[PDB]
C-alpha cells in the first residue's frame, strides 16, 4: 500500500498564493490619492483558476496574509491599515471617506515592522456553495441590447474587498508595496468538470480565441512514430 493524502482537495488547494500586488508610491499615476481598493478574486494567482475550475461548485474559508515592504525590500516604520469591506458594504471613494471609520467593516492596524498580518475570511455566498459557472442570468427579467455582458456572472461569489491605507492624515514618508497572500481552508468541492485546455481570455467569462485554438496536448509527426 501507499498514501492517498496528497491527492485530497486540502492537499491540492491549501497553499498560500500571491493574489495581489499593490504599489503605494509617493509619485506616479498608478495610485495617486494614497489608498487602494483591492476587490478579492481567487485569480491573480493565475494557476489557481484552472485548478478551481476542475469543479462547478466549491466551498471554503480563506486565510489572507499581508507581506508589506519597500521595493528595496527595506522595512520602514509605517503603520498601514488593512480594511475588509464586506459584500454590499460601500467601498471607500477617497482617503478621507467615512468608510474607513465605519466599523461594520473589520480593519487591521499593523506596523510594517511587525510580521505579516494574518486573518481568516469565512464562506460569504448566500448560496450553499460558490459557483464558477452560472449558465444563465442573475436578475429576473429583460432581454434587450447589451444585457449580454451580464451573462454568466454570479454576484453571490462576492467575498468582499480589502482596502489598504497609510494611515492618514498626511501622505506617507516611505514608498510602500503590500503583498496579499490567500490560502484556502476546509475545502469542499462538487460537480467535477473537464479541465481547461485553452488560454483564458477574460475573467468571469470562459470565452476563447476561436481562431487560435490550441490542442490539449503536444503532437507528433505520425501515428506510428516515436
Amino acid at each position: 500500500s501507499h498514501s492517498t493524502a496528497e491527492t485530497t482537495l486540502d492537499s491540492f488547494f491549501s497553499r498560500a498564493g500571491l493574489v495581489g500586488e499593490i504599489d503605494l508610491p509617493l509619485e506616479g499615476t498608478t495610485n495617486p490619492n494614497g489608498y487602494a481598493n483591492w476587490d478579492i478574486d481567487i485569480t491573480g494567482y493565475a494557476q489557481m483558476r484552472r485548478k478551481v475550475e476542475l469543479f462547478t461548485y466549491m466551498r471554503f474559508d480563506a486565510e489572507f496574509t499581508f507581506v508589506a515592504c519597500t521595493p528595496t525590500g527595506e522595512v520602514v516604520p509605517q503603520l498601514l491599515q488593512y480594511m475588509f469591506v464586506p459584500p454590499g458594504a460601500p467601498k471607500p471613494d477617497s482617503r478621507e471617506s467615512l468608510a474607513w471609520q465605519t466599523a461594520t467593516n473589520p480593519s487591521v492596524f499593523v506596523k510594517l515592522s511587525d510580521p505579516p498580518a494574518q486573518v481568516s475570511v469565512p464562506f460569504m455566498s448566500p448560496a450553499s456553495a460558490y459557483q464558477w459557472f452560472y449558465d444563465g442570468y442573475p436578475t429576473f427579467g429583460e432581454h434587450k441590447q447589451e444585457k449580454d455582458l451580464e451573462y454568466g456572472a454570479c454576484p453571490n461569489n462576492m467575498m468582499g474587498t480589502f482596502s489598504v491605507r497609510t494611515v492618514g492624515t498626511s501622505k506617507s514618508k516611505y514608498p510602500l508595496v503590500v503583498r496579499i497572500y490567500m490560502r484556502m481552508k476546509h475545502v469542499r468541492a462538487w460537480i467535477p468538470r473537464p479541465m481547461r485546455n485553452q488560454n483564458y481570455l477574460f475573467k468571469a467569462n470562459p470565452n476563447y480565441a476561436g481562431n487560435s485554438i490550441k490542442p490539449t496536448g503536444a503532437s507528433r509527426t505520425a501515428i506510428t512514430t516515436l
Binding site: 491549501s14 497553499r15 490542442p215 496536448g217 503536444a218
Partner: protein
C-alpha cells in the same frame, strides 16, 4: 508570568504553514451546507474514470482537431501492418495529455500504479477482423514485427464477439524507459459490399484503484 523562550523560526511566514488565525467575522454564521450531488473528496476518484485518449496527433489542421480522438483502421492494410503505437506514461507528453489523468498528473511530480486502456470499435455491425494489441515493458524497443509481438504480453482482439476490449497495464513508475503499447493487424479488415472500407477506434484510458500520485507541482496555462 510564564517562562517562554522564542526559538528560531518566529515571525517568519512560509507559504504552506498550516496554522490557525484570527477570524475577521466572529458571530457570522455562513449559509449552511445543503446537499449537492456528486461531491468528490479526492482527486484519485477522477484518475479512475475513463477519458478519451488522443493517440492520433495532427495539430496543424486546427480546423479538424476532432480527428485526434480516433484510430484509422481500413481495408488498405495487410497482415502484420503496424496500426498505431503510443507510450505508457501519463505524466509525460503527450497522447495521455488528453486524459483527465494525464493532466492531473501534470499538477504532480511522482506517481505509481497500474493503468488500463479500453479500446472501442466504432465500425459497422458487419465489419469483422482480428487485431493484435501488444504491450512492451520498459527497456527493449518495440517489436520488429507481429510474430515478435506475440512473444510478449499481447491480446488477440476480434470484432466478432467483442466490440470493446480493454488492456491492463501492469505497472508504471516515475523513477526519472517508458514501456510501449502497440496495436497490430492480426488479419485484414473484412467488410461486405455497401460497408465502409474504413472504420475508427476510440481509446479510453484511466487508472485503477492502485494508482497514487505523490508530489504537488503547478502547470502551464496562462491567465489573461
Amino acid at each position: 508570568g510564564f517562562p517562554t523562550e522564542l526559538k528560531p523560526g518566529t515571525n517568519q511566514f512560509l507559504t504552506t504553514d498550516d496554522g490557525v488565525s484570527a477570524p475577521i467575522l466572529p458571530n457570522f454564521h455562513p449559509t449552511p451546507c445543503i446537499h449537492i450531488p456528486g461531491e468528490v473528496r479526492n482527486l484519485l476518484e477522477l484518475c479512475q474514470v475513463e477519458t478519451i485518449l488522443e493517440v492520433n496527433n495532427v495539430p496543424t489542421n486546427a480546423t479538424s482537431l476532432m480527428e485526434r480522438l480516433r484510430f484509422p483502421v481500413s481495408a488498405q492494410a495487410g497482415k502484420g501492418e503496424l496500426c498505431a503505437v503510443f507510450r505508457a506514461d501519463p505524466g509525460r507528453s503527450g497522447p495521455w495529455q488528453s486524459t483527465l489523468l494525464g493532466q492531473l498528473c501534470g499538477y504532480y511530480t511522482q506517481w505509481s500504479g497500474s493503468l488500463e486502456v479500453t479500446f472501442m470499435f466504432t465500425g459497422s455491425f458487419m465489419a469483422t477482423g482480428k487485431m493484435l494489441i501488444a504491450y512492451t515493458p520498459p527497456g527493449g524497443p518495440l517489436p520488429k514485427d507481429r510474430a515478435t509481438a506475440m512473444l510478449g504480453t499481447h491480446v488477440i482482439w476480434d470484432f466478432g464477439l467483442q466490440s470493446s476490449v480493454t488492456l491492463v497495464i501492469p505497472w508504471i513508475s516515475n523513477t526519472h524507459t517508458t514501456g510501449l503499447v502497440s496495436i497490430w493487424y492480426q488479419t485484414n479488415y473484412v467488410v461486405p459490399i455497401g460497408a465502409p472500407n474504413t472504420a475508427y477506434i476510440i481509446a479510453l484510458a484511466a487508472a485503477q484503484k492502485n494508482f497514487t500520485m505523490q508530489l504537488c507541482k503547478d502547470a502551464s496555462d496562462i491567465l489573461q
